[PDB]
Amino acid sequence: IPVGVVAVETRTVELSIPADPANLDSEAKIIQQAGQVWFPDSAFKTYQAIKDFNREGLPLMVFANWRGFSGGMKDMYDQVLKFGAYIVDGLRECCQPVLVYIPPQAELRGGSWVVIDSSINPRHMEMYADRESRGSVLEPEGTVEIKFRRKDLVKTMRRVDPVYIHLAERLGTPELSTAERKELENKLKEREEFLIPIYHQVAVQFADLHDTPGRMQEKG
Amino acid sequence: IPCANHKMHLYLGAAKVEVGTEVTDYRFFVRAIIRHSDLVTKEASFEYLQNEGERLLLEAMDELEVAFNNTNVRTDCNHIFLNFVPTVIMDPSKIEESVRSMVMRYGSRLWKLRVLQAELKINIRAIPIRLFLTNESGYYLDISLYKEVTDSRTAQIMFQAYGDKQGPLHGMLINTPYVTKDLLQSKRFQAQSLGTTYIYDIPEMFRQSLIKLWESMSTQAFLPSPPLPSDMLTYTELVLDDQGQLVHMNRLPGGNEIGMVAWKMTFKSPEYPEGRDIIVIGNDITYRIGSFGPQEDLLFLRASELARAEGIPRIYVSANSGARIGLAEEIRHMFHVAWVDPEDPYKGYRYLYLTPQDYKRVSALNSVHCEHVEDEGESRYKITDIIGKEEGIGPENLRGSGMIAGESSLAYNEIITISLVTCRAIGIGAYLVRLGQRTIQVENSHLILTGAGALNKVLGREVYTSNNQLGGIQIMHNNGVTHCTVCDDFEGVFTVLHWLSYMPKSVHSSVPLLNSKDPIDRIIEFVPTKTPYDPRWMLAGRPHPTQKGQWLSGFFDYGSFSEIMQPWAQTVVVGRARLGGIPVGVVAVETRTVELSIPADPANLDSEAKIIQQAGQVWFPDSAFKTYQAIKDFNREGLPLMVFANWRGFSGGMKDMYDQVLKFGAYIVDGLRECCQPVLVYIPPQAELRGGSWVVIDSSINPRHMEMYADRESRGSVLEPEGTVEIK
Amino acid sequence: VISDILDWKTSRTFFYWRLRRLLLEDLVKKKIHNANPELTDGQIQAMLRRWFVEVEGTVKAYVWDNNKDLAEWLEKQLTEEDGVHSVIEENIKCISRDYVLKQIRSLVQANPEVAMDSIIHMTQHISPTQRAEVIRI
Amino acid sequence: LEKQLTEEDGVHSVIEENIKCISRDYVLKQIRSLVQANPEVAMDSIIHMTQHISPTQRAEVIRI
Numbered sequence A: 001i002p003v004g005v006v007a008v009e010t011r012t013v014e015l016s017i018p019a020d021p022a023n024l025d026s027e028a029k030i031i032q033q034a035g036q037v038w039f040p041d042s043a044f045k046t047y048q049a050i051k052d053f054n055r056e057g058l059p060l061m062v063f064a065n066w067r068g069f070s071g072g073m074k075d076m077y078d079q080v081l082k083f084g085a086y087i088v089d090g091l092r093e094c095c096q097p098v099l100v101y102i103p104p105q106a107e108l109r110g111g112s113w114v115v116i117d118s119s120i121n122p123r124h125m126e127m128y129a130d131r132e133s134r135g136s137v138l139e140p141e142g143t144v145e146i147k148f149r150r151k152d153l154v155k156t157m158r159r160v161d162p163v164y165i166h167l168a169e170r171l172g173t174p175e176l177s178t179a180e181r182k183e184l185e186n187k188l189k190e191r192e193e194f195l196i197p198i199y200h201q202v203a204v205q206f207a208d209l210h211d212t213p214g215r216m217q218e219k220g
Numbered sequence B: 001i002p003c004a005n006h007k008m009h010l011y012l013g014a015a016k017v018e019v020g021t022e023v024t025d026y027r028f029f030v031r032a033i034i035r036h037s038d039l040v041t042k043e044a045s046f047e048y049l050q051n052e053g054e055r056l057l058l059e060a061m062d063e064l065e066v067a068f069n070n071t072n073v074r075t076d077c078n079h080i081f082l083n084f085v086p087t088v089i090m091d092p093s094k095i096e097e098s099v100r101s102m103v104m105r106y107g108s109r110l111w112k113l114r115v116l117q118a119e120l121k122i123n124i125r126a127i128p129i130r131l132f133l134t135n136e137s138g139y140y141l142d143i144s145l146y147k148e149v150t151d152s153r154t155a156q157i158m159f160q161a162y163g164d165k166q167g168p169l170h171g172m173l174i175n176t177p178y179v180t181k182d183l184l185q186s187k188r189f190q191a192q193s194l195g196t197t198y199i200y201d202i203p204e205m206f207r208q209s210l211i212k213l214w215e216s217m218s219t220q221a222f223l224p225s226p227p228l229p230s231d232m233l234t235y236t237e238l239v240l241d242d243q244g245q246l247v248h249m250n251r252l253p254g255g256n257e258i259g260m261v262a263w264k265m266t267f268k269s270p271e272y273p274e275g276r277d278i279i280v281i282g283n284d285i286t287y288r289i290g291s292f293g294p295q296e297d298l299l300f301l302r303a304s305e306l307a308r309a310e311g312i313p314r315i316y317v318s319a320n321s322g323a324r325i326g327l328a329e330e331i332r333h334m335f336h337v338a339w340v341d342p343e344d345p346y347k348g349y350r351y352l353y354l355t356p357q358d359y360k361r362v363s364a365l366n367s368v369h370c371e372h373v374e375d376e377g378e379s380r381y382k383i384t385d386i387i388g389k390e391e392g393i394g395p396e397n398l399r400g401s402g403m404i405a406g407e408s409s410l411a412y413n414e415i416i417t418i419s420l421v422t423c424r425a426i427g428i429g430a431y432l433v434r435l436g437q438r439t440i441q442v443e444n445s446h447l448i449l450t451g452a453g454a455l456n457k458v459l460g461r462e463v464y465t466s467n468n469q470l471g472g473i474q475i476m477h478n479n480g481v482t483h484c485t486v487c488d489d490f491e492g493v494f495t496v497l498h499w500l501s502y503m504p505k506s507v508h509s510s511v512p513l514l515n516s517k518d519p520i521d522r523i524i525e526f527v528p529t530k531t532p533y534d535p536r537w538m539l540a541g542r543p544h545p546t547q548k549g550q551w552l553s554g555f556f557d558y559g560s561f562s563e564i565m566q567p568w569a570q571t572v573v574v575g576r577a578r579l580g581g582i583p584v585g586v587v588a589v590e591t592r593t594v595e596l597s598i599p600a601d602p603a604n605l606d607s608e609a610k611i612i613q614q615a616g617q618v619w620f621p622d623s624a625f626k627t628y629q630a631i632k633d634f635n636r637e638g639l640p641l642m643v644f645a646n647w648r649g650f651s652g653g654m655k656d657m658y659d660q661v662l663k664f665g666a667y668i669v670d671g672l673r674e675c676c677q678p679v680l681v682y683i684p685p686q687a688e689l690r691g692g693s694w695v696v697i698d699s700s701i702n703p704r705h706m707e708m709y710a711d712r713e714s715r716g717s718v719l720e721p722e723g724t725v726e727i728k
Numbered sequence C: 001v002i003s004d005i006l007d008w009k010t011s012r013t014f015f016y017w018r019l020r021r022l023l024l025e026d027l028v029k030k031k032i033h034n035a036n037p038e039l040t041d042g043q044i045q046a047m048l049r050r051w052f053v054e055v056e057g058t059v060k061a062y063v064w065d066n067n068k069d070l071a072e073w074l075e076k077q078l079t080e081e082d083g084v085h086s087v088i089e090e091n092i093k094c095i096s097r098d099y100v101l102k103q104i105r106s107l108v109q110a111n112p113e114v115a116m117d118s119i120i121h122m123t124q125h126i127s128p129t130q131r132a133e134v135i136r137i
Numbered sequence D: 001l002e003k004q005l006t007e008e009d010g011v012h013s014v015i016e017e018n019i020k021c022i023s024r025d026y027v028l029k030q031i032r033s034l035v036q037a038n039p040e041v042a043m044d045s046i047i048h049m050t051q052h053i054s055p056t057q058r059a060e061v062i063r064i
Ligand SMILES: *C(=O)CCCC[C@@H]1SC[C@@H]2NC(=O)N[C@@H]21
Pocket: A034, A037, A069, A070, A071, A072, A073, A074, A075, A076, B455, B458, B459, B601, B603
């Protein structure tokens, strides 16, 4: 069965821009482009492919692994937003089946979902996910930076770490002594600070449990 | 609070609260006493009133400035009271005029100092009068006037107004205390504290802007007498029922339970003085900061559906934070870590789990999916998926966002869509703006997909400082995203209405025609020359350079020309104008050389800013794409095109060929083939069309609508004369 | 390849009257198209040209390449009702009537199997003399 | 579905019969809609659709 194919590069690539010989003050440039990102050029290429295959009369098989759009100054100046809109306008005019599949070890995050969501063209578009897939608005790091800052991490440690629990319970005893309270406070400070990176990894794991395909299946 | 010149007695007041709720309302009160002998008026008290008003107002503001900066309690509604001892003989209306002017000229400072109420006591001749001023959002000043009347049954005294606009204090006791903020306040305050207008103040702005519109257009066309402001705008709020359908409801402002509000507005404009309809949709920045949820998305969708069903414009006011996110807090305080080494946690953990005591309290909610395991001799429920009992934070917001995005893409092709950016838009919000393709951007607002902080986290260093570096005017207005920039929300509303005055009231209506004050039968006084000139001079006209007065007329009606996307692709000019009262879209060509400035990305330390010289009478990738955008937008808007074609061809250099000039040149053709309105191409004098620039606007593309005309001082061919002699 | 050669100083007037003509023509052409959506552009334009001559007369047939005069005539046909009654509207109505009649005939002739299912309903809301003709023939 | 779409003169594809029912009723509704929305043409088409009919059908036309 012939199909159109869209897929995503995950390796880093080098874009080489030549120098114009009519401007002796110009220079050639190499720009690193990361994978799993939509740049102006790749977004426009995707739009071209979608439109061309719609006219050709073929269904689309999309292997979607985008972590979002580039928000840097230079891609915003080079009109990434416009081409991102073009993608939507392209998918809305599909007349053939459009099947989106999230491969294993792939994720869709935020802006990259809302432009290929099946709600654009409900009659034709479908979405499927692997078991090793992820999908959400924000990656786990960006979620913990908002909802699980250090204060809440410490609150978590208060009920987990045996050492920190023992010290916190000991300091709760009324009128032990000045010196002992000072020592306990310093021990608590050192222990809670020492345990931050591990509980940070725990936090992002917790947030990751919110981005699973089981949730997406329950929500429809 | 002590101060210099202690005739201006300053107090700081804190609202009385119970032992529960804390104090959040703090207000300054300036209470001044003005002592002076009585005045005998021989039309000689005007200077006294004006000078004392100005002097006392300035002193009040100065003392309040000092005391305002000396503390940090974050006051909201500061008040000034000026009690004048002397009696003056004056008509109260004249006092009203004087106070009005004095307050308006210094309204900016009063706004900065959060002075919202003011009272002035003064005796006439003697009968006391009390002037009550409300100065909220800085476009409209409300002045009321009351007399104190003692004709009561008890020893209590009450206010009596003058019948015309009795106002809230009519029949109220003069000793009414000052209240402690209300429904609208503490939400209006937050919104203004973010640099944006509160949502439920938007209708009022429209009304006041319409007034300005009826004034502004009075110099362009013969307009009828304007109706009173109470008949210029009427609106109904659009709310959701329990099923998800729209209900037309009349209720008090500030009663929204979701972050989205919409109205159907009917108003009378100079071009349609019988009433035209629009749908207005807006984000409430103060409701769960920004944040599209599922219900907000649904309301947006249903209102857009209404607009398409009626065929009327849709106005979107963007102040949001993108898709709503959240975390399942009911699990956050229950889970335990299964450590690899419970004594040394730095060798990893295997999983997260709930104990039976926690699992039994959530399993009936479908908030978490766990599997029973036996580990370390303990019964555990290992977590595999978290769902969350709270709706509106999960992946349902992705679907919803996509849903409304599709709606916008459809709306642009059926109705008019205009977007105004007042605070900020992140992510989906930006797309919702872009999909309207008609964007007004307030100063100090930004359209981004990713915040600066996230980018700094990803890149590993403090690359970006402000979100305005990513989506501010200096990017969005120069790359063709924003059409027009305004200084505040009120000007933005005005600009929306201004644009609407050129276009049909509905998709099923003709273009609005005006009875213009610029005669059709005149001649054009400005003549295009052979040397470079500003294309605006022929479109609109110029000040007569010989004299000080005297305007040299152009092609289009005087004052009707409005340019859009001005700094982007400056080799071509696009805009709206009127010809004899007939609105048209305008395309024209720059013949002067322009300088394109390209900034350097701070994320690439090896980048450099560049200046590129762009000649006139040439199609470049940017100017070609701009022309395509204009054509497509005016075809959807419903206006005919007037093209002043003066292109010598496309750029064939390496760098413009690499930057895809050919593609955009093709887009021009595809745009013109879909015109449904008249397209009139005119070659001005001392203008030429050569080669590639003709074949893309030739009337053969759309023969039913396109026409070409030439002046006597025009030229047109495949090749210029030099290129022809070099061959033949 | 061009329609005409214009002077710059007087272009304002020309383009005003031309655009006014074209917009009015668009209105009437849309009405014609809705009366018979199966017409093409040449047919529509020819209908308008013929109707102008037929109503005004052949001596006035030269008054066509005159944007002012013809715009005024079109406006009178489009803006006035219950009065002159806009003869052009009557011709448009003729087109619409014949078009729907052709659709009816086309559907029944392409599909005779439905002819007797609609024959009843269209012989109900008729005058008794019309019913007499139905019975007689 | 393939069996219903690819096989003819045989099983005869019952789904095709249901589609034909829809098509028949739709064109009938169009006829009724045009005459009811515009009675003035009812007697201009009444003749032509009573020509290519069986004599018994003509008898029913006369009788009613
Ligand atoms: C990779 O992790 C995300 C890359 C996002 C784009 C980056 S950020 C700064 C650079 N500027 C730009 O336009 N793109 C680059």
